[model samples]
Target chain A: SLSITTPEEMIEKAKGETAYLPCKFTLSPEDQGPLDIEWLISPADNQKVDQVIILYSGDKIYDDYYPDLKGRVHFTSNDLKSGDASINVTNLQLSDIGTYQCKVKKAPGVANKKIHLVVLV
Target chain B: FARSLSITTPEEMIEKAKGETAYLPCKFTLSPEDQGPLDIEWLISPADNQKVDQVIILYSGDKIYDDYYPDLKGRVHFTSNDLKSGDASINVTNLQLSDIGTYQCKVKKAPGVANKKIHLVVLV
Candidate 1:
C-alpha cells in the first residue's frame, strides 16, 4: 500500500551544480513489496516526450535508456521504507532546463508526476 | 543578402554603479529572410548557485513583458519597442547589490544562435 506525493512546483539549480529531485510517498503497514522507481525528463514544451534518465528496480540502478545522462544522474537515497525517493543531477547545463517527472511502481497504472528543473548560468 | 544573423554584446565584465540604471545592450543583424517572429528571453543568476530568474521576455510581435516577481517586475523593461531591428537591450532601473551577477540574453532564432551572456558587477 503506497501513495505518492510529487512536487507541484519547479526546483532551481545553478549551471554545473547538482540538483536533487525529491519524490515522497506514503506506504501502508500491510504492503512493503519491492518497489521500482523511475525518473523521466521532458524537453521544453514537449511534455509528452519522456526521456528516461534513470531506473531503479530493487537494489540495482540502470541508465542505459539515455546515454547522455548515464553518469550525470544518480539516486540520492537507497532507503525506500523512509518514503524518500530522490535523484541527483550534476554538471547542469542550459539545455538541462526542463520538466522532470517521477514515476513509482507502487501500484499498477500509477500516474507520473512532474517538476520543472531550471538551470541558471 | 546575408541570411546569417550574429549578435553583438559586451563580451567582458560590465560594471554599473548602485542606485543607478544599468543598460545592457544586445544587438543583432539578420537578412530579411531570417528576420521574423523570434523569442527573446532575459535571465539572471547570482554569482553562486541559485535558480535562474526570468527577467523578461520579448516576442517578435511587438510584445514585451516581465515576470511579476516583486524584485524584478516593473524594474526591468526593454530599451526599445522595435525588435525587428535586432536591438534587444534592457534597462534595469534602481540597480541593487543583489542584481550583480550573470545575465543571459537568448534569442531563439535557432538553438544557441544569438545567445549572449554578460557578467554584471554592481558597485556600491
Candidate 2:
C-alpha cells in the first residue's frame, strides 16, 4: 500500500525567519524503485499556477537556482526513503506568501498535498 | 554522469477540432540510474485563470485521472502502451472549449528534471 499525508498545522512565521512545511508518504516496506519528489509554489496573486521551486529524486536535489533563493530552501530530512520530504525555507520574504505543494511519486501509487504559509512582518 | 532530460516536441503549437482528439506528446531520455516505471504527469493551465489542473498521471501500470476535474475524467489517456520507452503523449477525446489553452507535460525519472508546455488551440 502507498499513501501521502501532511500536517494540519497552518504555518505562521515572521519574515527573515525559517518555515518548515511537512510532507510525508508511505510505500511498500522494501520497494526499491527510486522515489521522486517535487515542490512547487503558487504565489497568492497567482493562485492558479504553480512554479517549480525544487525537485528531489531520493539522493539528488535540483533547485531552479533562482538567485533570490539560491541557498535559502532545502530539505531537512536526509532519509527520504523513510518517507519524509519536508522542506525548510530560510529568510522568508513577502513574495513567499503562497501555497506550497509537495508531490511524491513511487511505483504503483502517487500522492500530493498543499500547505499555506503566511509570512508575517 | 549527470542525467540529461528534455522534451523532444519542436512545434509548440498544436491545433485540432472540437470533436477531434488532440495528441500532446512528451518524452525524456531514460538514464540507466533513473528507475522505472517512469512517472508522467500532464496538467492543463487554461489561460482563463492560469489555473493548473491535473489531467492525468500515468504511473505504476495504471492511468489515474483526478476526480477533482470531473469533466475530464474519462476523456484523457495515454497514447502509447509503454512508458519506459519514454512516450508521455496524451490523447484527449471529444475536446471542448475548456480544453483549449496551454498544457504542460512534466516527465520525472528520479535525478533528472524536464518539463515542456504546448499551446492547444481547439476550434469550435
Candidate 3:
C-alpha cells in the first residue's frame, strides 16, 4: 500500500564501464510486516536479462540475473527499515546499456508495485 | 533535516597536479527506522553558479538518467556492487586541469535535505 516515483537517467559509457540511477519512492506503513526492497531493469522492449537484476531485498541478493553484471550492482540495504528504493548500478557494457526502473510494493499487493526503469545508451 | 543521508565512504580530498583523476566512492541509501521510502540524488555543479546534473535516478527497476547530462557526457562511472550505503561514494576518473573545483553530493526529500562536499585541487 505505497506509491513510488523516481527520475532515472540512462548513464552510457564504454563496455567494461559502469552505470547508475538515483532512485526514490513512497511506501505505506503496516503493523509488523515484511517489506521487500529490490531493484530491476525492464527495458522498453520488455526484455530483461532474466526477470530482474535483483540487488538486495531486506537481506538477500539475486546473483543470477545477468552473467556479465555479476558484481556490478550497488544495492541500498540500509534503507530497508525506512523504505528507500534507490539503487546504483556498475560494470556496464554495450550489451548492458538500457533503461532501468525500481519497482517496489509492500507485499500485500505485489501487483500494485510501481517504479519505471528507463535507460538508453 | 528530516531526510538524513549519510555514507561511510571515505571521500578524502586528494592533492595532485593538473591533468589527473580523482576517485571517490560514495552512494545513497533510503530505508526507514520506523517509516517508508525516501528521495535521493547524485549531482555536481561544474561552475560556481550553474545548474545541477542529474547523473542517476532510481525507482524500482524504474529509471536511470544519464543521457541528459551533456557536459558530463562521458565523465561518470559506478563501482561494482548494487546501489547500497557503504564505503564507496563515487569514483571520478580521469581528472583534467579544468576538472578542478567543488564537488558536492546533495540528497534530499520533502521535509528533509542532506548534502556533502569534496574539494578537488588540480594543479599545474
Candidate 4:
C-alpha cells in the first residue's frame, strides 16, 4: 500500500515570488515497483484546462509538459527515491493560483494529494 | 473587470469500465450583469502526452455540434436539452481505453468565461 501526505492543504504566496507545494509518501512492503510521480494544476477561476505540469517516470524527469510551467516548475528534491515529492514554482504569477495535485503510483499502490495555492498581488 | 461566470464539476475524477457509459458532469451560472451569447465547448487532452486538446462537442448559435470530432462522433451528447438553464453536462458512451484522459468543459459568454475539468480513467 502507498500512503501520501501533505503538510498543508492551502499555501499563500505573493506575485513574483516562489512557492513550494509539499508532498511526501511511504510504501509498505507489499508495494514493490517502479515509482511514478506526476503534478497537475487546475487553474484558478476555473477558466483553463487542468493539465500536467511535471512528471517523473521511467527514471526520467519531465518539466516541459505544460508550456506555461516549462522552465518555471521543478521538483524540490533531486532524488525522488527518498520519498520527497515536493515541487517548487518560481516567479509565480497571478495565474499561478489554483489547485495542484500530486499523484504517486507504484504499480498496485497509488495515492494522490491536493494543495490549493493562493497568489496575492 | 467583473467576474460573473462560474463553472463547476462535482467530481474531479471518474472511473469506468470498458464498454460502459460515462457522465462527465459540468454546470455553469451567469450573473445578471453577464449578458452575451452563451457558448459551451467540450474538449479532451489525451493522457498519452499528446499535448494537444481535441474538441469533441460544442454548443453555439442555438445549435449543438456533437460531430466536431470524428472519433467521438455518434457517441456523445449533452445530457440536458436546455443549456441556458445552466446544465452543460455530457454523456460519453462505449468507453474505451483511448478515452481515458482529462476532459475540459468551457463556457463563454463574452465578458464571462469559465471552465472545469474532469479526469476519466477506464479499466479493463
Candidate 5:
C-alpha cells in the first residue's frame, strides 16, 4: 500500500541521539517495474538547520538533494518495485524537526506524502 | 524542471433556465521554461471532502462529463487558446437546478504535485 498522505506529528523525541521521521509508501505493482520515487521535503525555513534528502531507487544509497544527508538516511531500493517505499532517518537533531513529504512516481500518477520530525532535549 | 501551472480568469455563475446549457472558462500559464513530460489530473473535493479517485477521474484536451465532476461541471466550459503558453482552459455545459455550489478546477503535474485548484465559482 503506497500511502500518499502527509504526516503531521503531535509528539516529540529526546535529543542527543539518532532521531527519525518515517513516512510509509508502497508501489502498487512494485515487483514489475522501476518506479521513479523521489522524496521532496520543503527546505527548512531556518538557515541554522540543513534539510537534506536521500535517494534510494535501485539498491544504491546516496544523498542527491541536500548536502548534509549524504549518509544519514537509508532505504530498500531493490524491493521498491514490490510496493514497499518507506524511508528511515538517523541522527535526529533539534534542527531536524519539521514536516517532510515523499513524492513517488507511478506509471500513471504519483503520490505526495508528509511526516513530522520532532527532537526533544 | 519547474513550470507555471495556474488559473487566471475566474468563472462566473450566470443566470440560466432549467435544463439549459452553460459555459465556464479559465486561463493558465505554462512557459517553455516550465515544461514537463505532462501528467495532468483534474480533481475535486466533494461536499464529503473526499479525493477524486478510482471512479472519479477526468481527461484533458478531449474532456469528459462527470456528475462527480464537482457537481457543477454542467455549467463549466473552456475557451482559451493559449496552449503555446500552457493554458488549459476548461468549460462545462448543461446545468440543472440541483447545480448550485462551489466548484474547483485543479491542474496537477503528471504523477506528482497536487493538481493546483483553479478559477472557482458557485452556480445558480
Candidate 6:
C-alpha cells in the first residue's frame, strides 16, 4: 500500500514571501515500480479548471507546466525516491492562494494529499 | 495591458493509418515580458475516461524528454529542433489503435501559459 502524509493542511504567507508544503509518502515492499510525482492545483475560482503545476516522471523534474509558477516552484528535495514529495513556492502572490494536491504513484501504490495556501497582503 | 502568451493548433482532428506517422501541430507566440525559461509538453488522454492524461514528451532546461511515457517511448519526437522559435509540434510514428485520442500541447514561458489540443483518429 502507498500512503501520503502531510505535515500541514493549511499555510499562510505574506506577499513576496515563500511557502513550503510538505508531503511525505511510504510504500510497501510490494509497491515496487516506477515513481511518478505530480502537483496539481484547484484555484479559488470554481469555474477555473484544475491544473498540473509540477511533475516528476521518467526520473526528470518538470516545473514549467504553469506559466505563473515557472521558475518559482520546485521539489524541496533532490531525492524523491526517498519518499519526500514536498514542494517549495517562492515569491508568493495573492493569486497563489489555492488548494494544492500532491499525488504520488508507484505502480501498485498510489496516494494523494491536499494543502491549502492563503496569501496575506 | 500586460502581454500574454498564446498557443494555436492548426489542425483539430488528424486521421492516420495504423503504423503510419502522425503529426500533431502546435504553435505559440511569446511576448517581450515572457523572457523566462521556455517549457513545452505534449500530453495524451485516451478515449477512456478512467485513464488520466499523461505526458509523452517535454522540453525543459534546454533538453528534450521523449521517453517520459512508456507506450510512446521512442515513437514520439518534437518536430522542431529549436522550440524557442515557436514551433512545438510533435511526430508520432507507428501509431497504434491505442493512440487514438486527444493530445494537448502546453507551452509555458513564465508570465504566460497556453495550450491547445489535437485529436488523433487511427484507422485500420
Supply the TM-score of chain A against the true chain A for every candidate structure: 0.81, 0.85, 0.61, 0.93, 0.66, 0.93
Candidate 3 per-residue lDDT, tens place, A1-121, comes to: 4565544444545555544455555655431224454454545453543235553443444544434346676665465446565655565545555555565544331212334333344
1 versus 4: better lDDT goes to: 4
In model 4, the clashing pairs are: none
lDDT per model, in order?
0.66, 0.71, 0.46, 0.79, 0.46, 0.80
- Model 1, position B47: C-alpha lDDT score: 70
The CAPRI quality class of candidate 6 comes to incorrect
User: What is model 2's native contact fraction?
Assistant: 0.15
Runs of candidate 1 exceeding 4 Å displacement: A1-121, B1-3, B31-36, B53-55, B67-71, B110-112
> Candidate 4 lDDT, tens digit per residue, A49-121?
5577887765767776447578899999988988999999999988888999997756445678899999998
Which model scores highest in TM-score? Answer: 2
Best by lDDT: 6
Ranking by lDDT: 6, 4, 2, 1, 5, 3
DockQ of each: 0.03, 0.21, 0.02, 0.02, 0.11, 0.10
* lDDT tens digits by residue: candidate 2, B1-124: 3346667863488889998999888866765655533567777777666556544544433444433244367787777777667687887889888878778787766545567888999987
Q: Give per-residue CA lDDT, model 3, range B1-124, as digits (tens).
A: 1134454442555566655556654555433431223333355655444554423322222123333334344654445344433223455556666555556654422122245566667667
Residue-pair clashes per candidate: 0, 0, 68, 0, 21, 0
Give residue B43's lDDT in candidate 5 (0 to 100): 42
Evaluated on chain A only, model 6 obtains a TM-score of: 0.93
- Candidate 4 chain B worst ten-residue window by lDDT: B1-10
lDDT by residue (tens digit), candidate 4, B28-63: 888664565666778788887675456788776566
Off by over 4 Å in 6: A1-40, A43-45, A51-99, A102-113, A116-121
Which of candidates 1 and 6 is the stronger one according to TM-score?
A: 6
The better candidate by lDDT, 2 or 4, is 4
Steric clash pairs (candidate 1): none
Second chain of candidate 2: TM-score? 0.80
